[PDB]
Amino acid sequence: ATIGRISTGSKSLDKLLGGGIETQAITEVFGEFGSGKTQLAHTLAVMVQLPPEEGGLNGSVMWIDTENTFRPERIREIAQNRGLDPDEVLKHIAYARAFNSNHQMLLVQQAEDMIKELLNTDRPVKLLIVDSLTSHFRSEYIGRGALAERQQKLAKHLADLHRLANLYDIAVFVTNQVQANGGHILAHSATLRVYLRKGKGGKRIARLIDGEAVFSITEKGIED
Ligand SMILES: CCc1nnc(NCc2ccc3[nH]ccc3c2)s1
């Protein structure tokens, strides 16, 4: 399959990304609590449902929530202000809450069954969100003595996600909380790392890790 791109809603961020986030790729966004990672996730869950002329892929979405932060009301707001029908947009998001890191891993296997079911339809899965990818792994494997096993489980989880992205032509989008009092970047595992932070006057700033884009959080999700 060719590489598809999903617009983020921000022309600034799209330019930094070369057009949007890529299918057949894992995009990892990391930053402090409150930097706006979940707002970018909510916006992408709407954008992917637009036609390609508007930066979408006419796609379905699968969302794995580890922290109870998915907000259907926010999806409705973004959809309404992107000229879509909010009921239709929500109908094409499949949502699940991961109870712990082992259940989170099983949900990715279940995701593959639904991906196969929609593969040959007019609304194939094009976006798989894991928000937040590391939180259960961090809370369940505390202490230096457990770090080796934590890394083992995380590496298998990421390999599973890599496989789905490439095999089924899906954009995988994962968030990761990293700050002074806790958090670890996903080493070299993601296809692409995006650092997100707050700036003066409520602006958000994005940089590619291994220019900068600037945008706001609005009723449209994010925008310049
Ligand atoms: C934990 C209870 C649920 N079981 N399923 C749900 N919603 C549908 C569903 C099923 C599998 C999934 N894999 C990733 C997202 C996703 C969504 S909610």
Curated annotation (Swiss-Prot):
One GO molecular-function entry: damaged DNA binding
Species name: Pyrococcus furiosus (strain ATCC 43587 / DSM 3638 / JCM 8422 / Vc1)
Protein purpose: Involved in DNA repair and in homologous recombination. Binds and assemble on single-stranded DNA to form a nucleoprotein filament. Hydrolyzes ATP in a ssDNA-dependent manner and promotes DNA strand exchange between homologous DNA molecules.
Protein name (record): DNA repair and recombination protein RadA
Gene Ontology BP term (one): DNA recombination
Residue positions binding ATP: 31-38
Keywords: ATP-binding, DNA damage, DNA recombination, DNA-binding, Nucleotide-binding
Family recorded in the similarity comment: Belongs to the eukaryotic RecA-like protein family.
Superkingdom of source: Archaea
